[PDB]
């Protein structure tokens, strides 16, 4: 199941998400919430296999029928794509 | 070695390339010329592995230290990227 | 939404899946079922972006937390990888 | 241009490579030798774009007709593939 940090729980309380004891996770906009770290590890993994830019990954994810709300998705995605060495090497050309 | 079609040979003579009997290929600007068909099969293979845009593949090839002159490169490259189903599916976003 | 063929419905009835008239799709193992053709074009898209082998795509999908049941996934997946030209070119070496 | 370390020069002499003072680089099997570190950063870049296994990258490079001889290619290549996070994540499933 999901593991929420103090910072996650903090972000979630700010969003106004609610913890669901029955289903063993937090819920927001009607979806189970993906923790910040889980989201990072997932998006980082997906970028390594495709090296799609920020705009392409974002737009694809919104069409994905994802059952999850990804905490700090955009911020995490922007950080992943802008610090990718291989992509930096590509546009260096 | 390379296999040149009548149309390749046509393009090459117009370019002023020369056949090198010792090396079994045509030479131009100090570089062996890659036939139109070999160029297509190579660039298409490389795109399938990366799905880099026209601009990205072009800029990279210019930095590649490739020992070969690629016959009809841009034309072949633009066609490959503009007819890619996967890239079209990506940009559908 | 999903379009189910005669062949989908026969496979689904054979599985013992059940149709949800209210929610306008078939359900199996607690999941809405993705038709055979929709599954193919999706899995085909994912291979073009990664060119992962049969075994690797299978294992990854089983870990995917997919909200959909993919009809004839394994059979379709094998068809995709074994007819992929780019991968055929890769192992040709 | 190329920078050769003492370790490169040592490895090269063992290979029976030859230094060309006039063109100020080493030559081996009729090809200019790319230093160990340049070879690493190039091969690492290519793996990030493809994540091909050791055996496939190797077989492909042998068919590539690269204009450079890559110092310690196989050893460097195996190191690249066995320390890749994305590939490690893939078989983890
Ligand atoms: Zn990248
Ligand atoms: Zn493409
Ligand atoms: Zn493939
Ligand atoms: Zn890898």
Contact A80, A61 (CB under 8 A): no
Distance CA D85, CA A85 (A): 14
Q: Name which of B39, B29, B35 is nearest B9 in CA terms.
A: B35
Under 8 Å CB-to-CB from A16, ≥6 apart: which residues? A28
CB neighbourhood size of A16 (10 A): 7
Contact A81, A87 (CB under 8 A): yes
CB neighbourhood size of C33 (10 A): 26
Looking at all shown ligands, the one closest to residue B48's CA atom is 2
Cβ separation A67–C67 shorter than 8 A: yes
Q: Between A49, A50, A65, which is nearest C67 by CB?
A: A65
B65 part of contact set with chain D, CB < 8 Å = yes
Q: Between A60, A90, A93, which is nearest B90 by CB?
A: A60
Contacting residues of A for B90, CB less than 8 Å apart: 52, 56, 60
Contact C18, C26 (CB under 8 A): yes
Taking a 5 Å cut-off on Cβ, the residues next to ion ligand 3 are C 51, 84, 86-87
**E strand or H helix at A72, and its extent?**
none
- The strands making up C18-20's β-sheet, listed across from edge to edge, are C18-20, C25-28, C31-34, C69-70
Which technique? Answer: X-ray
Contact D71, D34 (CB under 8 A): yes
C44 Cα to the center of ligand 2, angstroms: 13
Strand ranges, E, within D29-88: 31-34, 69-70
- CA-CA distances (angstroms) from residue A40 to A29, A73, A79, B40, B85? 20, 8, 10, 38, 29
Partners of residue C69 on adjacent β-strands? C33
Entry resolution (Å): 2.2
b (16+ CB within 10 A) / e for B2-19: bebeeebeebbeeeebee
- CA-CA distances (angstroms) from residue B82 to A31, A71, B37, B46, B73? 37, 35, 18, 15, 14
Distance CA D84, CA D91 (A): 11
Q: How far is A18 from chain D (nearest CA, A)?
A: 32
Contact C70, C34 (CB under 8 A): yes
Contact A2, A38 (CB under 8 A): yes
Handedness of CA D75, B66, B61, C81 (dihedral sign): negative
Cβ separation D86–A51 shorter than 8 A: no
Handedness of CA B74, B79, B84, B87 (dihedral sign): positive
Strand ranges, E, within chain A: 18-20, 25-28, 31-34, 69-70
Contacting residues of A for D89, CB less than 8 Å apart: 45
Contact D5, D33 (CB under 8 A): no
Distance CA D19, CA D16 (A): 10
Beta-carbon-side half-sphere exposure of residue C32 (alpha carbons within 13 Å) = 15
Nearest CA in chain C to D88: C56
Distance CA B3, CA C28 (A): 55
Q: Name which of D79, B56, B58, B77 is nearest A90 in CA terms.
A: B56
SS3 letters across A46-63:
HHHHHCCCHHHHHHHHHC
B partners (3+ CB pairs within 8 A) are: A, C, D
Cβ separation A52–B93 shorter than 8 A: no
A36-50 vs A6-15: helix crossing angle, rounded to 10: 100
C65 part of contact set with chain A, CB < 8 Å = yes
Handedness of CA D26, D31, D32, D37 (dihedral sign): negative
Q: With H, G, I as helix, E, B as strand and everything else as coil, classify residue C36.
A: helix
Pairing of strands D18-20, D25-28: antiparallel
Q: With H, G, I as helix, E, B as strand and everything else as coil, classify residue D85.
A: helix
Q: How far is C71 from chain B (nearest CA, A)?
A: 22
**E strand or H helix at D20, and its extent?**
strand D18-20
Distance CA B47, CA A72 (A): 32
C45 Cα to the center of ligand 3, angstroms: 10
Nearest CA in chain C to D62: C93
Q: Between D63, D90, D93, which is nearest C93 by CB?
A: D63
Contact C35, C69 (CB under 8 A): no
Pairing of strands A69-70, A31-34: parallel
Handedness of CA A56, A62, A64, A66 (dihedral sign): positive
Distance CA A52, CA B8 (A): 36
Q: So where are chain A's domains? A: 1-93
Distance CA D1, CA A26 (A): 56
C54-62 vs C73-82: helix crossing angle, rounded to 10: 150
Q: Name which of A40, A52, A43, A38 is nearest A4 in CA terms.
A: A38
According to CATH, the topology of domain B1-93 is: Endonuclease III; domain 1 (1.10.340)
A64 part of contact set with chain C, CB < 8 Å = no
Under 8 Å CB-to-CB from A23, ≥6 apart: which residues? A32
D partners (3+ CB pairs within 8 A) are: A, B, C
Strand ranges, E, within B1-93: 18-20, 25-28, 31-34, 69-70
Distance CA C90, CA D57 (A): 9
Contacting residues of D for C62, CB less than 8 Å apart: 93
A65 part of contact set with chain B, CB < 8 Å = no
Q: Name which of C32, C35, C38 is nearest C66 in CA terms.
A: C32
């Amino acid at each position: 199941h999901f593991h929420y940090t103090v910072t996650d729980i903090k972000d979630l309380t700010k969003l106004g998400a609610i913890y669901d004891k029955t289903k063993k996770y937090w819920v927001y906009q009607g979806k189970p919430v993906m923790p910040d770290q889980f989201t990072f590890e997932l998006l980082d993994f997906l970028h390594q296999l495709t090296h799609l830019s920020f705009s392409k990954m974002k737009a694809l994810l919104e069409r994905s029928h994802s059952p999850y709300y990804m905490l700090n998705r955009d911020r995490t995605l922007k950080n992943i794509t802008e610090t990718c060495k291989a992509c930096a090497q590509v546009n260096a050309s």
